[PDB]
Amino acid sequence: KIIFRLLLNVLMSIIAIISYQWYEQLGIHLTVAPFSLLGIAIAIFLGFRNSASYSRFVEARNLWGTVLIAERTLVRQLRNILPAEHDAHRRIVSYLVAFSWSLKHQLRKTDPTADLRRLLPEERVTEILASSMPTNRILLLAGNEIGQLREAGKTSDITYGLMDNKLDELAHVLGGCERLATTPVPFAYTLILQRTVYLFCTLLPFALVGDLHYMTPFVSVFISYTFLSWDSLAEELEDPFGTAANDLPLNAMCNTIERNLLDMTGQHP
Amino acid sequence: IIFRLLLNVLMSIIAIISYQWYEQLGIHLTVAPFSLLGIAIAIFLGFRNSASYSRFVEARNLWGTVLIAERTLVRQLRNILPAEHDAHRRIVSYLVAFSWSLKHQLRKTDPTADLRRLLPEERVTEILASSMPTNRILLLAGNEIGQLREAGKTSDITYGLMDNKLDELAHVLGGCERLATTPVPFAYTLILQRTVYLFCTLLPFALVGDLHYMTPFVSVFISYTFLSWDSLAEELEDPFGTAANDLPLNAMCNTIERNLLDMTGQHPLP
Amino acid sequence: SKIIFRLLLNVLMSIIAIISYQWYEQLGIHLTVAPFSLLGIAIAIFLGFRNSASYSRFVEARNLWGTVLIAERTLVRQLRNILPAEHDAHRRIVSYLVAFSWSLKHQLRKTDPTADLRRLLPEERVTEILASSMPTNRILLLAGNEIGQLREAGKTSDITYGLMDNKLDELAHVLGGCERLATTPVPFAYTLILQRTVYLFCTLLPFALVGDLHYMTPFVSVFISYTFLSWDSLAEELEDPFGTAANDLPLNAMCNTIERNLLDMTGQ
Amino acid sequence: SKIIFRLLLNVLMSIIAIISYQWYEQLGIHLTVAPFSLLGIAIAIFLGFRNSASYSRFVEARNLWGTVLIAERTLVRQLRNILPAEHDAHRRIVSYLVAFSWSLKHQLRKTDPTADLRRLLPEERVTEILASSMPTNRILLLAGNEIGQLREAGKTSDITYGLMDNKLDELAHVLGGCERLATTPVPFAYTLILQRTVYLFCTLLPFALVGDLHYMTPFVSVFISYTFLSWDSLAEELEDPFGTAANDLPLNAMCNTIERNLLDMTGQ
Amino acid sequence: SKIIFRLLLNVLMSIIAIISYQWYEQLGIHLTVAPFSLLGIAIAIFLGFRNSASYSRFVEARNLWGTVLIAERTLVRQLRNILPAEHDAHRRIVSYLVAFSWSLKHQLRKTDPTADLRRLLPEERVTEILASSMPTNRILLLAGNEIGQLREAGKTSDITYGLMDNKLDELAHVLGGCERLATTPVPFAYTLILQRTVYLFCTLLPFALVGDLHYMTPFVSVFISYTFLSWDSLAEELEDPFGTAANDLPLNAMCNTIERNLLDMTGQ
Ligand SMILES: [Zn+2]
Ligand SMILES: [Zn+2]
Ligand SMILES: [Zn+2]
Ligand SMILES: [Zn+2]
Ligand SMILES: [Zn+2]
Ligand SMILES: [Zn+2]
Ligand SMILES: [Zn+2]
Ligand SMILES: [Zn+2]
Ligand SMILES: [Zn+2]
Ligand SMILES: [Zn+2]
Ligand SMILES: [Zn+2]
Ligand SMILES: [Zn+2]
Ligand SMILES: [Zn+2]
Ligand SMILES: [Zn+2]
Ligand SMILES: [Zn+2]
C-alpha cells in the first residue's frame, strides 16, 4: 500500500544518486528552493483537504449516533404512553431494528434479504425489498403501526405527533447518510492531490541530491512518508461507510442498536 | 486550463533563449521573492477554497432536505389518511413538480415540459404566470393540505404536522435562491484568478537562473498545482451556475420522483 | 479605490531604493529577503484568518435577510390555507409584513421610514410605530395583534395560532441578528494591526528587494504589494453589508422582491 | 498597550546584538536566519489557530447575549398578544426579565447584584434571589411562576402556555452557555506556554538577524515583534469575552438595551 | 508531562551531532537546512489542523455536559409551574435526574456507580438499573414512567406531557453524544503519524543544523523541539475530555453543581 510506494521512493533516490555523476553531462540543475515552494503549497492543500475529510467522518458517526437515540426514545415513548400495547412494542421494535440493518446494507451496497427475513414476516420482506429504497419503506411500515393505534383511539394526536417526530428524525438520518455516500467532489480528490503528491515525492530526490551526496534516500523517504501518510489518511476518512481500517464499524453499531431495543422491551438474547 | 499550461511552457522556452540579454541591463530575478509570493498566494488559495467548499456543502444539504421533507410528508399522508388516494396523487404531483421546477429555476432552464407532464394545464398556466413559480407550487400544495383540514379529514394537530414539511421546503427554496445569486466576493474572484495567472507566467523567468533547461518541467508542475487548485474553487463556488454538472441535480429530482411513486403504490406493475 | 494610490507610492519607493542603492554598505544598512519572507508569511496567515471572519459575518447578514422572505412567504401561505374566507385580515397582515421589511432596511441604513410606512399603513398605526424607541419591533407587536384578534374571535384555534406565531418568532430572530451585526463589527484591533503591518511591509519591501532585483524591483514589489493589498481590501468591502456601496447588500431590491412576493400570493 | 513595554525591551536586545557581531567568530557562535524562519513560521501557524479559537468564544458569547434580547422581546409580545389585559402580570414578568439580564452580567463579572436587583424588584424577592446558590436560575423560576399562575387561573390554555414556556427555556440555554464559557476557559497550558514561546523567539531573533541586517536589526526585529505580539495579546483578550478588556463584550450596554426595550413606555 | 525527558534527549542528540560533525566528510553525509524547513513547516501545518480537531472534540464534550444542567433545570421548573402541588413526583423525578448525571459520569469514567445510585434511589430500582447493560438509559426510561403516570392519572394533559417529554429527549441526545465520543475517538492515525514524525524530526534536526550553527546547535534545536512537542502534547491532552487528569473536564465538580442546583430548586 503506502510502504510499496515508500520503497519505490528509495529506488528513485538510488537512481538519482548513480545518475548524479552524469548530471553535469546535461543542461539540468535542480535547486531545492523551487521544491520547497511547491512542497509547502501541497502541504497547505493537504491540510485543508484532510480537514474536510475528517468533517465527513464526524458527520457520519453523528448520523449513526442519532439512530440509537431516536429509536431509544421512540421505544421509551411507546412504553410510557401505551404501556399495555406490547404487541405494537414488538412489531415496531422489529421495524426499528430492521431499519438499522437495512441502512447498513444500503451504505455498504450489500443484500439485506438475510437480516430482513430474520426480523420480519415474509410478506413484509417482499413489500420492503420491492421498493426503490427499502429503508424508506420500513419507516412507512413503522408509521403504520403508530398510525393504526391512532385510528383505534388508543392515542391522541398529541401523543401521536410525539412519536411521529422520532420517525421524522430517522428519516433525516437516512437522508443524511444517503447524502454522505453519494457526495464525491469531482476528480480533484485524485487529479490534483493523488498525482501531485506522488509526482512531487518521486521528483524530490532528484532535487535533494545536489545538497546531500548520499543522505538523499533518508531525507527523501522522511518527507515522502510525511506527505503520503497525511494524504492516505484523508482517503480513509473520506469514505466512512467502507471496509477500511479507520472506517465506522457498522456491524458493531447495529448489534448495539438491537441490544438496546431488546433491553427496553424485556427480551433476553 | 491546458492552454495556460502550454502558454507556460512557451514562456519557459522564451525565458531560456532570452536569458542571454538580461545581462547588464540590471534585470535580475531571484527565487526568494517569488517563493514569498507563491506561499502567500497558496495561503489565500487555501482560505478561498475553504469558503467555496462550504457553499458546495450547503447546496447539498438543501437538496438533501428536499428528499427528506417530501418523503416524510407523503409518509404522514399514508399513515394519517390512508384512504384519501386522490389527495395522495395530487400532493405527490406538486412535490415532484416542486423538485423539477426548483432545478429549472437554479439552472435557468425552461420548466414548461416538466410541469406539463405532472400537472393539468390550468395549474401549469397559473404556475408559469407567477414570477416565482417554485413558490406558487408550494402555495398550491398547501391548498391541498388546507382543504383536507376544512373538509374535517385532519385535525389541527395533524395539519400542523404536515404544514411543517412545507416549511422545510420553503426554507430550502429561499436558501437556494440566496446561493443562486452571485456570491459575496463581488467580482473579486476575478482578481485572485488573474493574480495566479500572472504568477504562473512570471515564474519561469524567476526559476530559469537556478534551473536552466529544467525550467519548462518544474515551472509547469508548479503552474499545474496552482491552476488546478484555483479552478477547483471555481467549480465549488457555483454549485447551480451556468456550465455546471447537472448529474447530481438530475439524479436527485429523479430519485425523489421514483421514491414518491413507490410510496404511493404507483410504480410496481400489476 | 485607494489601493491604486498605494501601488503608485510603492512605485516611488522602488525608484528611491534603486538610486539610493549605493549608500547602503556605507551607512551599514543591508536588507535581505529572508526576514521579510518570515514577516510576509505571518502577515498572510493573519490576513487569511481575518478575511475569514469578515466573510462569515457578511454571509450571516445575507442569511438573515433571506429568512425575512421565507417567514413572510409561509405566514401568508398559512393565512390562505387556514382562513381563505378572511380576505380582509390577509391584507392587514401583509401590510405589516411589508412594513417590517422596509423598516428594517431604514433602521440598518439609519434612514427615514416615515415615507414607506405611510404607503402601507394608516396614519394611526404609523404614529404608533414611530412613537416607539424601537419602531421595527413595534411592527411585529402589531402583526401579533392581527394574529391575536383572529384567535380571540374564534376564527383560529390555539394550535393554528401557534403555527402563525412561530413565523413572527423567526422574524424576531432576524431583527435581533441584524441589530447585533450592526452594533458588533469585527474587532477594530484586527483591522488596526493588519492595516499597519500590511502597509509598513509593502513600503519597506522594495528596500529589501533591490539588492537581489535591481531594475526588476518596481515590477515585483508592486506585484507583491498588489497581492497583499487586494486581499486586505477584500475585507474592507465585506465588513459593511448593510450599507449602500456597490459591494453591499441590495436591501432596496431585497425589500422590493419581498413586497413583490407577498402581493403575488394575495393576488394583487 | 501591554506590548509597549515589551516592544522597547526588544529594542535593547537589538542593540546588544549589533555591538557583538564581530565577536561571534571569537566566541564561536554562528547564527543564521533559516532556522528562525522555521521556528517563526511554526509559531505563526500555531498563533493563527489559537487566535481563531479565541474569536469563536467571542462570537458565541455575543450570540448568547443576543438571544436574551430576542427571547425576552417575544415573551413580552406573546403576553401582550394572548393576555392583553393582564398589565399587572405584564409588569411583574417584565421586571423579572430585566433583573435576569443584570443578574447574569454580575454573575459573569463576579460583581454584586444587590444594587440592580433592588432597583427592579420588591425587597421580599431580593432576599429570595440573593439567598440562592444560582441567583440567575432563581429569577427564571420566579418568572415561570408568573406564567404558571396565569395558567392555573384559567387565563391561559396549555397551548399558549407552552408558547411562553419555550421562551423561558431559551433563556435557560443562554444561562448554561454563559456559565460554560466562564466557569471553564481554554486550557491554561494554551496561554501559559504559548506566551513563553513568543517572548523567547522575539528576544532571540535579533541575535540571528544581525548578520544579515548589520544595522537594520532593531527595525526589522521590532516589526516582526509587533506582528507576533499584537496577535497573541489580542487572542488573550478575546478568550475572556465577559471580562473588562478593551476588546471584550460591552455587557453594561447590552443590559441597558434590554431594559430600554422591555420597559419601552409600558409593557414594551 | 514527560516532555522534559524528550528535551534532554535532544540535548544529547545535539552534542552527539557536534562530536560527530568531523566524520561527516569521511562518512560522506551532507545535511542542509533547506529540506528540514519544508518538512518542519509541513509538520507544523498538519499539527495545527490536528490540534484544531482535538480542541473541537473537547468543546463538544463540554457542550454535552452543559445540556445536562440546562435540561434538568427546566424539567424541575416545568414540574413546579405545571404541578406545584404534586410533590410526590417532584422528589422522585429529581432523584432520577441526579442519578442520570452520576450514572453518566461513572459511565464515561468506567467506575462503579453503585455508591452514588444507592445514595439516591431505593434498592428495587438500584438493582433493576444495575441489572441492565445500559444503566443510564434505564434511568431515563424510569424517569419517563414518572411523567407517564402523571399523564395517565389525569394530572397533566398530553400538551404538558409533551412539553416535559422533550426534556428527556434532550437528555437522550446527551447520552448518545457522550457515548459516541467515548467509544469513537479521534482516528488513531493522527497520534500514530504525527508522534512518529515529530519525534524523528526533533532528533534528526541537530544533525542538519550543526553545519550552520556549530556550537549553537543545542540551544536552537531544543527550542524548536520544545515548540513542536508542547503543541503535540496539548492536542493529546485535549483528545480525552472524560479523563481523570486536571487537564480534562471536572466531571465530579459538574455533578456536584447539578445535584446542588436541583436540590435548590426544590427547597432542600
Ligand atoms: Zn431526538
Ligand atoms: Zn411492551
Ligand atoms: Zn423533517
Ligand atoms: Zn394513496
Ligand atoms: Zn421505482
Ligand atoms: Zn420557517
Ligand atoms: Zn385573501
Ligand atoms: Zn458600504
Ligand atoms: Zn426564539
Ligand atoms: Zn401591558
Ligand atoms: Zn554589522
Ligand atoms: Zn432545552
Ligand atoms: Zn416540590
Ligand atoms: Zn405522598
Ligand atoms: Zn460493584
Residue numbers in the entry:
A (entry chain C): 23 to 291
B (entry chain E): 24 to 293
C (entry chain A), D (entry chain B), E (entry chain D): 22 to 289
Q: What text comes from the article?
A:
BEST1 localizes to the basolateral membrane of RPE, and has been functionally identified as a CaCC in heterologous expression studies. The simplest and most logical conclusion based on our results is that BEST1 functions as the surface CaCC to generate Ca2+-dependent Cl- current in human RPE.
As the Ile to Thr substitution changes a hydrophobic residue to a polar residue, which weakens the hydrophobic interactions, this mutation may change the channel property by altering the local interplays between spatially adjacent subunits, but will unlikely disrupt the channel structure as its localization on a loop renders flexibility. Sequence alignment reveals that BEST1 P274 is identical while I201 has a highly conservative substitution in KpBest (P239 and L177, respectively), prompting us to test the predictions from the BEST1 homology model with the corresponding KpBest mutants (P239R and L177T, respectively) expressed from E. coli. While no crystal was grown with KpBest P239R, well-diffracted KpBest L177T crystals were obtained under the same condition as KpBest WT, and the structure was solved to 3.1 Å resolution. However, superposition of KpBest WT with the L177T mutant based on the alignment of single chain residues 174–180 showed an obvious shift of the TM region. By contrast, no currents were obtained with KpBest P239R, while currents with reduced unitary conductance (mean amplitude 1.5 pA) were recorded with KpBest L177T, suggesting that the BEST1 P274R and I201T mutations result in a complete and partial loss of single channel activity, respectively. The structure of KpBest I177T suggests that the BEST1 I201T mutation does not alter the pentameric conformation of the channel. The condition contained 0.05 M zinc acetate, 6% v/v ethylene glycol, 0.1 M sodium cacodylate, pH 6.0, and 6.6 % w/v PEG 8000.
